[PDB]
Design an enzyme around this catalytic site. Structure first.
Site: not given
Ligand code: ATP
Ligand code: MG
Ligand code: MG
Lengths: 985, 75, 147
Positions: A9, A424, A458, A461, A525, A580
């Site tokens: 990352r 993180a 992971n 960080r 997200n 397209c």
């Molecule tokens: N709907 C949700 N319910 C619970 N936890 C969630 C949800 N959406 C995301 N998370 C959590 O949010 C965190 C996202 O943090 P981060 O993006 O740093 O971690 P990652 O997705 O494991 O890593 P990377 O993005 O580097 O691949 C993750 O622990 C994911 O489990």
């Molecule tokens: Mg993950």
């Protein structure tokens, strides 16, 4: 030899060269209090060559107010010795040592020097040597709610990249002889006056294609000028311009010279008169400490404040500063001189770590030079702050009581928070809460929920996780780590493994949400963010949103009945390339990568799903015949993957891969060129293959080429995985098999009743009956970017590069292919630290229950250019309903579970409004245009029964309320918005 | 007055206009002469793109000025 | 969300389509099924075409998914029914309505754009032999758009 499996990352932010140069730089850290240890942690995670510590002072109890590597058993032991042991385990590539004594010449062993918690005279002595020997010197200080950062990288610092952005590139419509360069239609270059660009593939003006950078004169959002091109040519058509970024030279000044004539960096323009005050204040603070054997002013002491103000006056007179000192602000600084907060420490540590990375990598624009920051708006007003309340009690929370007092500490100890996610940002938030003593009281409680598992990437960080913890749940590891850090949180934390969504409402129900105090989001997200926002709005709980993107970050606070919710805000959308462009006429590598991803999905995922579903659903064919858009395609896929092209060995997989190569990279190109020859013209006479459209050329299969062989291997391996065969990677078998391949002839076709159903039936009956094949299942290929042993990214890279070679586009390596295809979000530790600090500074505001809207600050920052900004939250919009003031977001109607007719009558008689549409969830319960029979059938039923009937699903036992969206018209028929309805079952 | 509009291929069209004429009228004339819909006409003069709702005088267009006409591409 | 959805569903009735009928499929606002009448001055005259519109969960912050269901012989529409447009793909500003989409598809049917086609073979036929293109369009709209 960068371990891309660990720095995956970070490399998307810095790059390979930055880390290669960074793995040869030494960092010295003087002072190992909270700020020093935070900086050391961030640097160790960054990946510098080594870290050395120097802080020989004995540990005290109050030092644990912001130190998370110290325990009460460490009283009397030097801080560095007890911190190095725990720092050495964060990263295995970064040795950490300790030096008992510091000598000036010893400073030549380091590339960057960070100084904290040191007297001004010692700082001057160190700087006088670290300036003339070209050593980066960064001095940081944190006093209560105030922070100071000073950077000095020498007088001949070279900054290669000043913003961290990718070079701007674009296409050209026409170029005049006067140097007027014009972009395409509705295309904005984004350049600025003074930039340098170079042109290539320009038709009619070959001279501009030499590559010599030229100045840029902005003339408009779509056009600019370069000067005079009289000699080079007359008029130019088409071409591509690319910006060239040149290194810049930045010259600093020594500390001694800059004390007299500083150069401030303003973090906020609403308070521009403060930095000059703080500049005097910190020097006076150092002088007072020197005048009291290093003893800072006691908390909320009037006499010490008066003495400090006298020192400030003396210094202001001495330095000929023509500024009138603000007594109130200076005395407030004096009161909080002994303060030590973990949020400010984390914020400043992240900032200084980013500055160190800038100094070592010679990248991004640094601070120039002073940076004074304050968050004085966080001072509580609902508690009694005095000398008596702020005196230390000999406990580990002295550093925070000395600022907020014991009563506010008790208020914090009884919090009941809810943290979503344990990434993180989640880890940093948990660390801050553990240090602050959140929910350490009798009524306190913490809940953390996250369903993901820890992976290797992971660990870069997320400092709470160790390599031995790879593969376990995040919540359990985080809870264990924070219980180890603070023993008082044993039994006060509950860790779930449930995804926060519509399916987890049986656990996060009314009982769960009625005991919380605030919700903090650590998601990645937007959908989950919106879901949590809706839940918080329904329950009217404060929400803390934080987002990061590379070096940029933002934090937002949502307060009930005061500010609007997150949903009101919106992030920029995602640009989906027109079908397209992707399907036929690509002109960038992103198009080829997207095409490769779609091809992978259509070759290895969808057909297997269709085959598996055929053997499971007893009535699949009939449903597909009248439901699927292309039943013929599904039937063909099923036949091909069951009987026609079912492999019996790996050689057949290789043959199939070769056939697919020919089909997708040699035949379709011939068909396209047969439909649109290279000399074809448009309707207006213009050449067809000009501008965004590039003339393709078919590829001939050459086994000796690396890319062709890579594609063959990847396709064969994926096919074998789909059919559960034994794959091989030895080139000998591939070269033996592919030698004996006869390419079937192919010639482009020019073209020139109800039997289609008969043909489809004939195809269908050719399939073996499902009863004949019992227990025979094919394994679909689920895309996984993080795994390097499944040939997924290899196949995508191969396909993208081959398609780029088809259209003469620049191929991309596996690194960028993984970055683009996998939708990887760049992340950094410094940005996480900064956002955690800002969120925790807003948290103390929320705890104090501040009512005014000007006392909260949504924050935005960009660490590439050292930009920080804070703005007041947007107030929730008001409206006039029935001649009354209604809040658009935080107001609702509370009604019993009455019948629909009674609800309509209530809205007609109370609000004087005519209901026209009533919905709940994703269903339209009631509308004004429905047939009268349906309404008459639905009117005398209760809302719960109506929802049960419409949704064809019984309400679960845990459900206790319904949220209804109602749109109604007034007496004259004019539509007027109204707040939602909260039906109580 | 008279003006010249240069196309992407180097063609020059001569138009009879007045300094007070609106951009819309000029786009209408260009549609009448070349058949290019106004929505796809992007007229530029002295490095500034002419915008609907204004007049030629707003852009300081004078006797025998030269404009450039580029055509928007549909999706 | 459903606010917007309904507001547009409602103004649709107050905006006599004349050539459309966007109707929600049952009681799931997130899946309409509209219709389009063949323009009189087109080879597709006298035809009824059904379209499926799936609103994304982020509507109107994301473009709706509009896919043809009746097979049509048009240069810029493939057999799967995918529609070649920018207001639906990248030009989807959050300042649009179903009306616009449903008169922009009608305009597209009025005159195709073969310079940037989606089906190269049909585009080639249209550019070279207009009469054959006319005959094929009439045959297809009679076989599919009728009955
Ligand atoms: N709907 C949700 N319910 C619970 N936890 C969630 C949800 N959406 C995301 N998370 C959590 O949010 C965190 C996202 O943090 P981060 O993006 O740093 O971690 P990652 O997705 O494991 O890593 P990377 O993005 O580097 O691949 C993750 O622990 C994911 O489990
Ligand atoms: Mg993950
Ligand atoms: Mg993530």
């Amino acid at each position: 030899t960068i371990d891309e499996g660990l720095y995956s990352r970070q490399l998307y932010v810095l790059g390979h060269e930055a880390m290669k140069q960074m793995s040869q730089s030494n960092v010295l850290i003087i002072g190992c209090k909270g700020l020093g240890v935070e900086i050391a942690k961030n640097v160790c995670l960054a990946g510098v060559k080594s870290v050395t510590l120097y802080d020989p002072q004995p540990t005290r109890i109050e030092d644990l107010s912001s130190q998370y590597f110290l325990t009460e058993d460490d009283i009397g032991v030097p801080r560095a010795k007890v911190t190095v042991s725990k720092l050495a385990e964060l990263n295995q590539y970064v040795p950490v040592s300790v030096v008992d004594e510091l000598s000036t010449e010893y400073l030549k062993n380091f590339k960057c020097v960070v100084v904290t918690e040191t007297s001004l005279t010692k700082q001057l002595e160190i700087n006088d040597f670290t300036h003339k020997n070209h050593i980066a010197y960064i001095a940081a200080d944190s006093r209560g709610l105030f922070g100071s950062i000073f950077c000095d990288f020498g007088e001949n610092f070279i900054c290669t990249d000043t913003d961290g952005n990718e070079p701007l590139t674009g296409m050209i419509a026409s170029i005049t002889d006067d140097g007027v360069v014009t972009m395409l239609e509705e295309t904005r270059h984004g350049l600025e006056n003074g930039d340098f660009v170079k042109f290539t593939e320009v038709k009619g003006m070959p001279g501009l294609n030499d590559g010599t950078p030229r100045k840029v004169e902005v003339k408009g959002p779509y056009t600019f000028s370069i000067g005079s091109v009289k000699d080079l040519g007359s008029a130019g058509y088409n071409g591509v311009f690319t910006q060239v970024k040149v290194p810049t030279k930045i010259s600093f000044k020594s500390l001694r010279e800059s004390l007299k004539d500083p150069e401030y960096v303003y973090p906020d323009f609403g308070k521009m008169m403060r930095p000059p005050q703080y500049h005097i204040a910190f020097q006076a603070l150092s002088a007072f400490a020197d005048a009291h054997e290093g003893s800072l002013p006691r908390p909320r002491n009037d006499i010490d404040a008066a003495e400090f103000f006298e020192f400030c006056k003396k210094i202001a007179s001495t330095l000929q500063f023509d500024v009138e000192l603000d007594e109130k602000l200076i005395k407030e600084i004096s009161y909080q001189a002994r303060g030590d907060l973990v949020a400010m420490s984390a914020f400043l540590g992240g900032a200084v770590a980013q500055e160190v990375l800038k100094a070592t990598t010679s990248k991004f624009y640094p601070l120039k030079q002073y940076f004074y920051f304050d968050s004085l708006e966080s001072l509580p007003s609902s508690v009694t702050i005095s000398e008596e309340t702020c005196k230390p009690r000999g406990c580990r929370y002295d550093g925070q009581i000395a600022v907020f007092g014991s009563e506010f500490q008790e208020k914090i100890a009884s919090l009941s928070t809810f943290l979503v996610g344990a990434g993180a940002i989640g880890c940093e938030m948990l660390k801050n809460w553990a240090m602050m003593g959140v929910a350490t009281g009798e009524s306190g409680h913490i809940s953390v929920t996250d369903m993901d598992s820890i992976e290797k990437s992971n660990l870069n960080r997320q400092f709470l996780f160790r390599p031995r913890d790879v593969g376990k749940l995040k919540s359990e590891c985080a809870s264990t780590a924070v219980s180890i850090m603070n023993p008082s949180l044993t039994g006060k934390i509950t860790s779930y493994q449930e995804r926060v969504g519509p399916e987890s409402e049986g656990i996060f129900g009314d009982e769960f949400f009625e005991k919380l105090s605030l919700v903090t989001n650590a998601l990645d997200n937007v959908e989950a963010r919106m879901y949590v926002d809706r839940r918080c709005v329904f329950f009217e709980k404060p929400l803390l949103e934080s987002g990061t993107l590379g070096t940029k970050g933002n934090t937002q606070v949502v307060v009930p009945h005061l500010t609007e919710s997150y949903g009101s805000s919106q992030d920029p959308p995602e640009k989906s390339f027109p079908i397209c462009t992707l399907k036929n006429f690509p002109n960038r590598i992103e198009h080829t990568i997207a095409w490769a991803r779609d091809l992978f999905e259509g070759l290895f995922k969808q057909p297997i799903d269709n085959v598996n579903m055929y053997l499971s659903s007893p009535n699949f064919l009939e449903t597909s015949l009248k439901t699927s858009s292309n039943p013929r395609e599904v039937l063909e896929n099923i036949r091909d993957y069951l009987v026609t092209e079912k492999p019996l060995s790996f050689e057949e997989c290789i043959m199939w891969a070769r056939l697919q190569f020919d089909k997708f990279f040699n035949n379709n190109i011939q068909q396209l060129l047969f439909n649109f020859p290279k000399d074809s013209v448009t309707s207006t006479g213009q050449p067809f293959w000009s501008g965004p459209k590039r003339a393709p050329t078919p590829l001939s299969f050459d086994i000796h080429n690396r890319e062709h062989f890579d594609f063959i291997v990847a396709a064969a391996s994926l096919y074998a995985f789909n059919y559960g065969l034994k794959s091989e990677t030895d080139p000998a078998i591939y070269e033996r098999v592919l030698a004996g391949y006869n390419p079937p002839p192919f010639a482009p076709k020019s073209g020139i009743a109800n039997k289609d159903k008969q043909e489809l039936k004939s195809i269908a009956d050719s399939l073996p009956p499902p009863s004949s094949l019992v227990g025979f299942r094919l394994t679909p290929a689920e895309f996984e970017k993080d795994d390097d042993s499944n040939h997924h990214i290899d196949f995508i890279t191969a396909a993208s590069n081959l398609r780029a070679m088809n259209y003469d586009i620049t191929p991309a390596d596996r690194f960028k292919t993984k970055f683009v295809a996998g939708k990887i979000v760049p992340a950094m530790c410094t940005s996480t630290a900064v956002v955690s600090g800002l969120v925790c500074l807003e948290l103390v505001k929320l705890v104090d229950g501040k009512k005014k809207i000007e006392e909260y600050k949504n924050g935005f920052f960009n660490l590439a250019i050292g930009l920080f900004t804070f703005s007041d939250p947007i107030a929730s919009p008001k409206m006039k309903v029935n001649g009354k003031e209604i809040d658009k977001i935080w107001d609702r109607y509370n009604l019993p579970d009455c019948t629909l007719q009674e609800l309509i009558d209530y809205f007609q008689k109370e609000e004087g409004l005519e209901v026209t549409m009533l919905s709940s969830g994703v269903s339209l319960l009631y509308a004004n245009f429905q047939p009268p029979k349906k309404l008459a059938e639905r009117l005398p039923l209760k809302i719960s029964e109506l929802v049960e009937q419409i949704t064809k699903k019984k309400l679960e036992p845990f459900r206790k309320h319904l949220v209804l969206e109602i749109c109604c018209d007034d007496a004259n028929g004019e539509d007027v918005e109204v707040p939602f309805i909260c039906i109580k079952l | 007055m008279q003006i010249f509009v240069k196309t992407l291929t180097g063609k020059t069209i001569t138009l009879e206009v007045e300094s007070s004429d609106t951009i819309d009228n000029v786009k209408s004339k260009i549609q009448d002469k070349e058949g290019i819909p106004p929505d796809q006409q992007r007229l530029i003069f002295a490095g500034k793109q002419l915008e609907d709702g204004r007049t030629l005088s707003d852009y300081n267009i004078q006797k025998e000025s030269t404009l450039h006409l580029v055509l928007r591409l549909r999706g | 969300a459903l606010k917007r959805i309904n507001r547009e569903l409602a103004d649709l009735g107050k905006d006599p389509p004349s050539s459309s009928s966007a109707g929600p499929v049952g009681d799931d606002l997130f899946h309409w099924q509209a219709t389009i009448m063949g323009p009189a001055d087109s080879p597709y005259a006298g035809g009824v075409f059904f379209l499926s519109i799936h609103f994304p969960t982020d509507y109107p912050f994301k473009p709706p998914k509009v896919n043809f269901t009746t097979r049509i012989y048009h240069p810029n529409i493939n057999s799967n029914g995918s529609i070649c447009l920018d207001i639906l793909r990248d030009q989807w500003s959050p300042a649009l309505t179903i009306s616009k989409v449903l008169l922009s598809i009608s305009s597209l049917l009025t005159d195709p754009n073969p310079d940037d086609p989606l089906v190269p073979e049909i585009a080639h036929v249209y550019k070279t032999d207009r009469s054959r293109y006319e005959l094929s369009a009439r045959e297809w709209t009679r076989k599919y758009a009728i009955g």
